[PDB]
Amino acid sequence: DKEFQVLFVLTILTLISGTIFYSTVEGLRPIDALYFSVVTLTTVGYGDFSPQTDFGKIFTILYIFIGIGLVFGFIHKLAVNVQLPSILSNLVP
Positions touching a copy of itself (CB under 8 A) are 6, 10, 31-32, 34-35, 38-40, 42-48, 50, 54, 57-58, 60-61, 64-66, 68-70, 73-76, 78-80, 83, 87, 91
How far is residue 3's CA from residue 17's CA, in Å, rounded to a whole number? 22
Closest distance between Na ion and the C-beta of residue 45, in Å? 8
Asked whether 77 and 43 are in contact (CB, 8 A), the reply is: no
Contact 28/22 with Cβ under 8 angstroms?
Answer: yes
Nearer CB in complex with Na ion: 65/91 = 65
